[PDB]
Amino acid sequence: SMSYTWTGALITPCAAEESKLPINPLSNSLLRHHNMVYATTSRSASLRQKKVTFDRLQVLDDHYRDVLKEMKAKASTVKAKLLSIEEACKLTPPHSAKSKFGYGAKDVRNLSSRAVNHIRSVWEDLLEDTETPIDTTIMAKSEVFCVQRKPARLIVFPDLGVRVCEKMALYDVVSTLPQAVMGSSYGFQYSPKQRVEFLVNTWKSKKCPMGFSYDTRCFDSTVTESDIRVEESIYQCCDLAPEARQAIRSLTERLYIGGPLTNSKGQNCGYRRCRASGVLTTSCGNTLTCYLKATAACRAAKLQDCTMLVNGDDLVVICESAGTQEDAAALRAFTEAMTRYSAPPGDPPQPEYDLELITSCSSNVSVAHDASGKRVYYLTRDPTTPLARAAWETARHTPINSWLGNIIMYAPTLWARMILMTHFFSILLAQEQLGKALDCQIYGACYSIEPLDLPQIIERLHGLSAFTLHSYSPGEINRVASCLRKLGVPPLRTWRHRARSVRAKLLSQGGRAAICGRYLFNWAVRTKLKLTPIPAASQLDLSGWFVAGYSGGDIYHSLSRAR
Ligand SMILES: O=C(O)c1c(-c2ccc[nH]c2=O)c2c3occc3c(F)cc2n1Cc1cc2c(=O)[nH]cnc2cc1F
């Protein structure tokens, strides 16, 4: 069937859309080539619509059925809890899209009678009605990139009341079931440090390793009605409250498998028969579907001793080499099996015999040295997108601060330490906002974090070595230096000067600011300060940062204020 059908009504914005990076002094201090930075808008939605619309011709076989049964046997161990309306409301981000039913996310979080009454009515409707398709809004996503232009991605999501019901029925399932089914292959259970540990250990555990990333083209569009019902058959293996079993059954047929598309003007836009990007099950469903197809495809291709790592549609496989010619033919057989399963490739996969040459979750393993000179592996990435977005977030107030998430997740990197930390600490200190909580996203869930708490967060996630790394790889230094020239970012000597200046100001303030000066900026001086374990680090409640993926799932993981 067709992934989408369209009526001809346009994908519309619900307000003016900004496409160009503003010419602003603060963003200009970071990046001078402002014309190279753009944001996607609804103006490119028709180009995306064409790419995402195609027929799917899925063929399943014995390997697929065998893997599915193995996955279901593990899912059979799960006991999932139904969330109360109150627990589900508390998981709603404060700036979540309002309902069309007279209330918003703040009303949901406050347990307002209008919000709660409506959510209850939606819940009762899921229990009673097993068929009526649930309306969804389709919007063009606004994302910032550097030129060389990508058309806007399309987001599809149901109303706020439905999103709260999805949490009640499925938040516990999507949080716990992926690891029960996929074990060590489930990517979202790992912090970046644990991910690099798993990749390096897996790589070195093979006699002669071969690894590859597999890029599925337009993964959400490749997801079939069969795949969604297969996904539900795994969820159905959980022990569930009867209303949760009905709600999962109803949500599967009325929302997850497909449904009508409405634009921001309320016009009938089309019909979806593939994965919606903006529902609670997107991450979990995508991961299960990708793991299932890839595990079966590995068997069809006769790949030896596979270890996979999956995060949604992002797949990396590390196996035992059978020889160069054999590996090349076995990868072609894997691709052919994936294509039959409706997971055709974007970039054709290529065997890799150097772990540092593999990109997974847009990241690569690199090496640096700590204060003792010992090798430390860490995850890095090309800094182009992070810097273009950091420039955008400097010029405009954005709901999610990608810069903060990048500092947290890429804390050991040369670029996050020298550029991101220096830039934002300089500006926030000047504005008396170092202690002001900001929203960022970790594995798709929203968190409200104070920049002053970064030292303990980094110590907990990455270890104290994140504050001592030096002698970065020549390849990594070259990539950073090249990006800076491309974007018109000041050279690293300028960043060192700016860091020495903000470090001095931070130290002069005492308190948490002085902890930031000491730990975050020790790289900037010769007269190193002693870095001991931060008392605040061990007390940090990181319960739930690295449990599961929630991208598009409308999840907020920071604490609710007691009413
Ligand atoms: O956004 C993520 O879920 C994320 C981060 C992250 C980075 C920065 C801020 N907050 C974050 O959670 C992250 C991450 O951060 C550092 C290492 C590392 C890593 F290995 C995997 C990581 N993921 C999964 C993830 C990231 C990307 C991606 O970035 N591009 C394309 N496809 C992707 C597919 C994915 F499944």
Short mmCIF file of all heavy atoms in Angstrom, two decimals, residues 188 192 195 311 314 360-363 379 381 405-406 409-410 441-444 551, ligand 1:
data_model
loop_
_atom_site.label_atom_id
_atom_site.label_comp_id
_atom_site.label_asym_id
_atom_site.label_seq_id
_atom_site.Cartn_x
_atom_site.Cartn_y
_atom_site.Cartn_z
N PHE A 188 19.43 2.62 23.69
CA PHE A 188 19.04 3.68 24.60
C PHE A 188 19.31 3.41 26.10
O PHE A 188 19.11 4.30 26.92
CB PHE A 188 17.60 4.13 24.32
CG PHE A 188 17.38 4.80 22.97
CD1 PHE A 188 16.64 4.18 21.98
CD2 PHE A 188 17.87 6.09 22.73
CE1 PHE A 188 16.40 4.83 20.76
CE2 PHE A 188 17.59 6.75 21.53
CZ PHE A 188 16.88 6.10 20.53
N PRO A 192 26.55 7.83 26.72
CA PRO A 192 27.58 7.80 25.67
C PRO A 192 28.84 7.00 26.09
O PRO A 192 29.39 6.25 25.30
CB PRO A 192 27.89 9.28 25.44
CG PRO A 192 26.64 9.97 25.78
CD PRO A 192 26.12 9.21 26.99
N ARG A 195 28.07 3.41 25.86
CA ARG A 195 27.96 3.05 24.44
C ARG A 195 29.34 2.84 23.85
O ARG A 195 29.57 1.86 23.15
CB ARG A 195 27.19 4.13 23.67
CG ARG A 195 27.02 3.79 22.18
CD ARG A 195 26.25 4.86 21.44
NE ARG A 195 26.15 4.54 20.01
CZ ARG A 195 25.11 3.91 19.46
NH1 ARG A 195 24.06 3.57 20.20
NH2 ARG A 195 25.12 3.63 18.16
N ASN A 311 19.12 1.99 17.71
CA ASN A 311 18.43 3.14 18.32
C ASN A 311 17.44 3.60 17.28
O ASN A 311 17.83 4.30 16.36
CB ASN A 311 19.40 4.29 18.65
CG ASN A 311 20.49 3.97 19.64
OD1 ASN A 311 21.32 3.09 19.42
ND2 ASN A 311 20.52 4.73 20.72
N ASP A 314 18.32 3.67 13.57
CA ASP A 314 19.79 3.69 13.48
C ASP A 314 20.36 2.36 13.84
O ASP A 314 20.20 1.88 14.97
CB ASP A 314 20.39 4.83 14.31
CG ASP A 314 21.80 5.17 13.89
OD1 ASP A 314 22.71 4.36 14.16
OD2 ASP A 314 21.99 6.23 13.27
N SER A 360 27.65 5.82 13.69
CA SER A 360 26.35 5.29 14.17
C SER A 360 25.79 6.35 15.12
O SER A 360 26.54 6.96 15.90
CB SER A 360 26.47 3.92 14.84
OG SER A 360 27.29 3.93 15.99
N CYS A 361 24.49 6.65 14.96
CA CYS A 361 23.83 7.75 15.66
C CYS A 361 24.62 9.04 15.37
O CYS A 361 24.88 9.85 16.27
CB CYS A 361 23.68 7.47 17.15
SG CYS A 361 22.50 6.14 17.51
N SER A 362 25.06 9.16 14.10
CA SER A 362 25.87 10.29 13.59
C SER A 362 27.15 10.52 14.43
O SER A 362 27.72 11.61 14.39
CB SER A 362 25.02 11.55 13.52
OG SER A 362 23.99 11.33 12.56
N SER A 363 27.63 9.48 15.11
CA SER A 363 28.80 9.60 15.98
C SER A 363 29.87 8.57 15.68
O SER A 363 29.57 7.50 15.15
CB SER A 363 28.36 9.50 17.44
OG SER A 363 27.29 10.40 17.71
N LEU A 379 32.92 9.30 22.34
CA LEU A 379 32.15 9.50 21.14
C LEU A 379 32.17 10.96 20.75
O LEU A 379 31.92 11.85 21.57
CB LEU A 379 30.70 9.00 21.33
CG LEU A 379 30.56 7.46 21.27
CD1 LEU A 379 29.21 7.00 21.81
CD2 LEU A 379 30.80 6.92 19.82
N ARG A 381 31.42 13.64 17.00
CA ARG A 381 30.68 13.79 15.76
C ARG A 381 31.19 15.01 15.02
O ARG A 381 31.86 15.87 15.62
CB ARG A 381 29.16 13.91 16.02
CG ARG A 381 28.69 15.20 16.76
CD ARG A 381 27.20 15.45 16.60
NE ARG A 381 26.90 15.94 15.25
CZ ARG A 381 25.81 15.64 14.56
NH1 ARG A 381 24.84 14.89 15.10
NH2 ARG A 381 25.65 16.11 13.33
N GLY A 405 22.22 20.13 25.51
CA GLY A 405 22.24 18.69 25.30
C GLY A 405 23.56 18.24 24.71
O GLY A 405 24.08 17.17 25.07
N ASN A 406 24.14 19.07 23.80
CA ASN A 406 25.42 18.73 23.19
C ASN A 406 26.56 18.81 24.20
O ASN A 406 27.45 17.97 24.18
CB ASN A 406 25.68 19.57 21.94
CG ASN A 406 24.91 19.05 20.72
OD1 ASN A 406 24.92 17.84 20.43
ND2 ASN A 406 24.38 19.94 19.91
N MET A 409 26.10 15.53 26.40
CA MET A 409 26.37 14.29 25.69
C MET A 409 27.74 14.18 25.01
O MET A 409 28.23 13.07 24.78
CB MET A 409 25.23 14.01 24.70
CG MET A 409 23.87 13.89 25.37
SD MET A 409 23.73 12.40 26.39
CE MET A 409 23.25 11.21 25.08
N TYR A 410 28.30 15.33 24.62
CA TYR A 410 29.61 15.38 23.96
C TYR A 410 30.65 16.14 24.81
O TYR A 410 31.65 16.63 24.26
CB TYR A 410 29.47 16.00 22.55
CG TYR A 410 28.70 15.13 21.59
CD1 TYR A 410 27.39 15.43 21.23
CD2 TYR A 410 29.29 13.99 21.03
CE1 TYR A 410 26.68 14.63 20.32
CE2 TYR A 410 28.60 13.18 20.13
CZ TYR A 410 27.31 13.52 19.77
OH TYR A 410 26.61 12.70 18.91
N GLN A 441 17.19 18.04 25.49
CA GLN A 441 16.65 16.71 25.28
C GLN A 441 17.75 15.67 25.34
O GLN A 441 18.82 15.86 24.76
CB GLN A 441 15.93 16.63 23.92
CG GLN A 441 14.53 17.20 23.94
CD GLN A 441 13.93 17.18 22.55
OE1 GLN A 441 14.29 17.97 21.68
NE2 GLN A 441 13.03 16.25 22.29
N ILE A 442 17.48 14.56 26.06
CA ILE A 442 18.39 13.44 26.14
C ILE A 442 17.59 12.22 25.69
O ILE A 442 16.56 11.92 26.30
CB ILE A 442 19.00 13.24 27.55
CG1 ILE A 442 19.69 14.56 28.11
CG2 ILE A 442 19.94 12.02 27.55
CD1 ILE A 442 20.93 15.06 27.38
N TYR A 443 18.03 11.57 24.60
CA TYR A 443 17.32 10.40 24.05
C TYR A 443 15.82 10.67 23.81
O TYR A 443 14.93 9.81 24.04
CB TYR A 443 17.60 9.17 24.94
CG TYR A 443 19.01 8.61 24.82
CD1 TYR A 443 19.43 7.57 25.65
CD2 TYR A 443 19.92 9.14 23.90
CE1 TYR A 443 20.70 7.01 25.50
CE2 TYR A 443 21.21 8.61 23.78
CZ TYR A 443 21.60 7.56 24.61
OH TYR A 443 22.85 6.99 24.50
N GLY A 444 15.55 11.91 23.39
CA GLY A 444 14.22 12.37 23.05
C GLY A 444 13.34 12.86 24.17
O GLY A 444 12.32 13.47 23.90
N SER A 551 12.06 9.95 21.41
CA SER A 551 11.91 10.95 20.35
C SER A 551 10.53 10.87 19.69
O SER A 551 10.10 9.78 19.30
CB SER A 551 13.02 10.84 19.31
OG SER A 551 14.27 11.23 19.85
O1 LIG B 1 19.31 12.61 20.42
C1 LIG B 1 19.63 11.48 20.74
O2 LIG B 1 18.70 10.54 21.01
C2 LIG B 1 21.00 10.97 20.87
C3 LIG B 1 22.12 11.65 21.39
C4 LIG B 1 22.07 13.01 21.87
C5 LIG B 1 22.96 13.96 21.44
C6 LIG B 1 22.89 15.33 21.92
C7 LIG B 1 21.93 15.69 22.77
N1 LIG B 1 21.01 14.77 23.23
C8 LIG B 1 21.00 13.43 22.86
O3 LIG B 1 20.17 12.62 23.33
C9 LIG B 1 23.22 10.75 21.23
C10 LIG B 1 24.60 10.86 21.54
O4 LIG B 1 25.21 11.92 22.10
C11 LIG B 1 26.52 11.57 22.21
C12 LIG B 1 26.76 10.31 21.70
C13 LIG B 1 25.50 9.84 21.26
C14 LIG B 1 24.99 8.67 20.65
F1 LIG B 1 25.83 7.69 20.32
C15 LIG B 1 23.63 8.52 20.35
C16 LIG B 1 22.76 9.56 20.65
N2 LIG B 1 21.43 9.72 20.46
C17 LIG B 1 20.62 8.72 19.78
C18 LIG B 1 20.56 9.11 18.31
C19 LIG B 1 21.17 10.29 17.84
C20 LIG B 1 21.11 10.63 16.46
C21 LIG B 1 21.73 11.88 15.94
O5 LIG B 1 22.27 12.69 16.69
N3 LIG B 1 21.62 12.05 14.56
C22 LIG B 1 20.99 11.14 13.74
N4 LIG B 1 20.42 10.06 14.15
C23 LIG B 1 20.47 9.77 15.54
C24 LIG B 1 19.84 8.61 16.03
C25 LIG B 1 19.87 8.32 17.39
F2 LIG B 1 19.23 7.24 17.84
#
